[PDB]
Each structure stands twice: as structure tokens, then as C-alpha cells.
Amino acid sequence: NLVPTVATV
Amino acid sequence: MIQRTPKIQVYSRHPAENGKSNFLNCYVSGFHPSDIEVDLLKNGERIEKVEHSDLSFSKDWSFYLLYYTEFTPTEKDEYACRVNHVTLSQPKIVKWDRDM
Amino acid sequence: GSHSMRYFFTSVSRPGRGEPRFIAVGYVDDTQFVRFDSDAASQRMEPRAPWIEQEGPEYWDGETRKVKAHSQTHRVDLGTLRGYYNQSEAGSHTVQRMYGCDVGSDWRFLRGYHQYAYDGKDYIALKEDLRSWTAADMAAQTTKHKWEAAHVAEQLRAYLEGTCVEWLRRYLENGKETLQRTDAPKTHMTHHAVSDHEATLRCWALSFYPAEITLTWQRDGEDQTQDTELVETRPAGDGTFQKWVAVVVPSGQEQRYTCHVQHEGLPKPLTLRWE
Numbered sequence: 456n457l458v459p460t461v462a463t464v
Numbered sequence: 465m466i467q468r469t470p471k472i473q474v475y476s477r478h479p480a481e482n483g484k485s486n487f488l489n490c491y492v493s494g495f496h497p498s499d500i501e502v503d504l505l506k507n508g509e510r511i512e513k514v515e516h517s518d519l520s521f522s523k524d525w526s527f528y529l530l531y532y533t534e535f536t537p538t539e540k541d542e543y544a545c546r547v548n549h550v551t552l553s554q555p556k557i558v559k560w561d562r563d564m
Numbered sequence: 565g566s567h568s569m570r571y572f573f574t575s576v577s578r579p580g581r582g583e584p585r586f587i588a589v590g591y592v593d594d595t596q597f598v599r600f601d602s603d604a605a606s607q608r609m610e611p612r613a614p615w616i617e618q619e620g621p622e623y624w625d626g627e628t629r630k631v632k633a634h635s636q637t638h639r640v641d642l643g644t645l646r647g648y649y650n651q652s653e654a655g656s657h658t659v660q661r662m663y664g665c666d667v668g669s670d671w672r673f674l675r676g677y678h679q680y681a682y683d684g685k686d687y688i689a690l691k692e693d694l695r696s697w698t699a700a701d702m703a704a705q706t707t708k709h710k711w712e713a714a715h716v717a718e719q720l721r722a723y724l725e726g727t728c729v730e731w732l733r734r735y736l737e738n739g740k741e742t743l744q745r746t747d748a749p750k751t752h753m754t755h756h757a758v759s760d761h762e763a764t765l766r767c768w769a770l771s772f773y774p775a776e777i778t779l780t781w782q783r784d785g786e787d788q789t790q791d792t793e794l795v796e797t798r799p800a801g802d803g804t805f806q807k808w809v810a811v812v813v814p815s816g817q818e819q820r821y822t823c824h825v826q827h828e829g830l831p832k833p834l835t836l837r838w839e
Contacts (some may be wrong), residue, residue: 457571457590457630458592458663458723460829461637462716464644464688464707465655466684477801491798495768496684497658498576517799518599518612519587520572525660525681527574532801564754564766564808 468526469551470495474544474560480537484528487509488560501548505557507541510515534552537562566674567593567743569732570664575638577657584642586635591664592735592743594775595803600631607632615739634661643684648703656744658683663720671736676724687728694721747773747804748829753836757815765838766810767823771800778826779809789823 470492475488490502498519504511517530535543545558570591575584586602588609597613611617638659646657663678679689687698688707695717699708711717711826716742732759736743749769756764775797781788791812798806813821818838825834 456641456727457627457634458720458727458745459630460719461661462711462714463637463640464648468684469632471796473798473807475798487800488803493796497656498574499656509797518589519574520589521574521662522662525684530799530801535757557798563756 466496467551468494470500470547470554470556472545472558474548474558475564476503476537476539476560476562482537482539485534485536487532488543490518490531490547490558491528492531492547493522494526494547495520495528495551496526497550499550500509500529500531501546501555503546504531504533507545508544509535510546530535554562566666566668567671567678567732568664568666569728569735570662573634573638574657574659575635575642575659579641579653579656584639588631588634592732592739594657594773594805595739595743596736597739598627600628600635603634603674610661613739613742615735615742615807617804618738626727637750645687645703650681650705652813659687660684667729667730668733671733673729674727676721676728678720678724688768690815691716694724742803746827746829747771747828749777749825749834749836751823751825752810752834753823753838755838758812761815763815764810764814764817765813765818765821765823766806766808767825767836768806769825770806771802771804772806772829773826774828776828777805778824780824781809781824782822782824783809785822813835 471494473491475489477489480486486503490503490504504514511533514531514533521527544557546555546557548555573588575586575721577584588600590598591595594791595613595618595625598609599612609631641659642657668674676694680687688704689698697708699705703710751771752768754766767779769777781792794809800806811821823836
């Protein structure tokens with residue numbers, strides 16, 4: 456189950 | 465830019481016996497960048513039906529892929545894996561050694 | 565023993581036209597269970613283990629939406645990083661991301677991780693405590709400040725300690741017949757003569773799972789590393805793994821040499837000898 460959100464660098 | 469040369473192993477999925485269906489593998493690892501050309505050869509000739517794993521990488525960030533094809537070993541047929549990558553001046557050929 | 569769930573993501577920019585090539589894979593221990601490839605026709609997260617096919621349409625819709633969201637973050641990142649490093653539009657560049665959780669024998673949280681690389685080099689990683697960041701250079705430092713202000717680590721920590729662990733536990737149960745089964749190595753030894761005075765002994769381990777294994781040689785009961793060659797553990801292609809270790813010996817002295825195999829599928833380590 457993937458992480459809900461991914462922050463941009 | 466970092467550039468790392470692929471390591472190559474060529475081998476069968478199951479113990480190799482003449483007349484008995486099997487898979488021939490070419491495992492390429494430790495390379496960067498990810499763009500790579502890998503062919504399986506039968507008697508010096510490129511095999512057409514070759515599949516490969518989904519690209520992944522190790523802790524050190526180097527990539528690995530498994531290329532594979534169904535084959536039936538015979539006494540006379542010779543097999544190899546041919547690899548080209550940015551780090552290589554000429555394609556590298558590794559022969560399958562069944563007696564290893 | 566211990567277990568892990570890990571996701572791996574690679575995006576490779578395509579300067580001349582269009583979006584980056586994006587490939588995502590998820591593993592439980594050494595078993596791949598899902599994948600997404602931006603070049604594939606479905607544009608869906610796809611099953612790669614039969615036990616994940618138990619999950620319903622909502623799962624597949626939700627994983628697809630998230631993996632696409634991952635891909636768009638990577639696309640933006642590639643442009644931002646080209647900016648940070650003052651690079652041209654001409655070259656191909658790569659971002660890689662890995663995250664996941666480890667649990668011990670009791671299936672409780674042990675460790676979480678989230679790391680990121682640009683062109684194969686460390687860029688930024690979550691520290692062990694899951695509260696702060698390791699930034700390798702000044703570009704990564706600017707990212708660290710951005711993520712600190714926006715409390716990114718708090719969001720990740722919650723996922724890694726909660727959801728990640730919960731869903732690993734769920735997969736372990738659903739896939740129990742394979743995921744909780746050990747396959748002990750099938751071992752044998754081969755002999756080769758290089759000349760009239762030199763021999764090679766090769767100790768083989770096949771059809772094992774998980775991938776973790778130790779193979780070593782002893783001479784007259786003491787560890788021998790000189791004149792040995794140990795290959796990288798390699799996938800068989802049927803979910804199991806293979807490895808060998810070889811030693812060069814004077815012909816006629818084969819009997820001094822023993823191979824020793826350690827694997828979680830073996831209650832006690834195994835010994836092999838020639839002849």
C-alpha cells in the first residue's frame with residue numbers, strides 16, 4: 456500500500 | 465555523471481539437461497545509468513523471444529535486470545549473453561558454461 | 565523471522581519529447597507483488613503475485629491514482645533538480661526513490677526508511693528516528709528546509725509506523741503459503757582440473773528463499789578466503805535464488821576442504837565435501 460502523498464524537492 | 469559498468473552472469477533456471485525444457489538467464493547488475501542493451505544468443509545469433517524483469521536497484525542505487533528465454537539445451541548448441549552499455553567500448557559477450 | 569515491505573521508483577528524463585520513463589515496483593521481502601510501467605498499455609498498477617489478486621477494485625484504483633501521483637512528483641523533481649544543478653535540457657537524468665518498513669519476528673515495527681537519489685548519488689534521506697533529514701549537498705539542504713516547514717517527516721512517520729506495518733501484516737497473512745514458507749538451499753559440489761596440479765571445487769546452493777545466505781570454505785576446519793571466488797546471489801526466475809562459492813586447491817588435497825551453508829531454511833548449518 457503506497458504512501459498517500461509524495462512531496463516534491 | 466556517475467557511470468558504473470554492469471556485472472554479468474549467464475545461467476539456466478533449472479539444472480541443465482539435454483532434451484529437457486528450461487530457461488536461459490542473463491542477469492545484469494551494478495550498473496548506472498539504466499539504459500542497457502542485452503541480447504541472448506544461440507550459436508552467435510540473436511534470440512527473438514526474450515523477456516526481462518521490471519527495473520529495480522540495490523541500496524547503492526545501482527540497477528539490476530534479469531533477461532530470460534525458454535530453451536531446450538542440446539549437446540551442440542552454444543549460448544551466450546551480449547551486453548552493451550555506455551561504459552563499454554565494445555559489447556561484452558559472456559558464454560553460458562553448463563559444466564560450471 | 566523479520567519481514568519487510570519496500571517500494572522502488574525510477575524516473576529517467578526524455579529530453580527531446582514527452583514525459584520521463586517511470587517504473588515502480590513493490591516487494592514483500594524478496595517477492596515482487598506489484599508494478600507500474602509508464603510505457604505499458606494499461607496505465608494501471610498491476611499484480612505480480614497471486615496473493616495480491618485477492619484485493620478488490622478499490623485497491624487497484626487507489627494504488628493506480630497514488631502511483632501516478634508519484635510519477636508526477638518525479639517529473640517535477642527532474643526539472644527542479646536540473647535547475648538546482650545548473651544543467652542543460654540536452655542530457656538524460658535519473659531520480660530514484662526507495663521507501664518501506666521492517667518488522668521483527670513479532671511483526672511489530674522495527675525500522676522505516678525513505679531515501680532519494682539524483683543521477684545515482686545520495687540526495688536526501690529520512691534519518692533512523694523518522695524525525696529529520698540527511699541532505700548531502702546545498703541543493704538537498706534547500707529541499708530539507710522546504711520539507712521541514714511543511715512537516716513532511718511527520719506525514720511519512722505516520723505512514724511508515726502505521727499503514728506500512730498494517731498492510732505488510734495483511735499481505736503476510738494473505739500470502740502465507742509462500743511468503744511465510746522457507747525454501748532451504750539444494751546443495752552440491754562440482755570439480756574441475758585446470759592442470760595436472762591445480763583443481764577447482766565449486767559449492768552450489770540452488771532453489772532457496774529468502775535470498776539471504778552464507779556460503780564459506782574451510783581448510784582443515786579453519787576459514788579459507790584466499791584463492792576463493794564468491795558470486796553475487798542471483799534470481800533463478802521462478803522466485804527462488806542461486807549462489808556458488810569456489811576454491812582453488814592442489815590436486816589430491818580436495819579432502820581438506822569443506823563447504824559450509826547457512827540459511828534460515830536450515831535449522832543448523834550444512835557441510836559438504838568432495839567425493
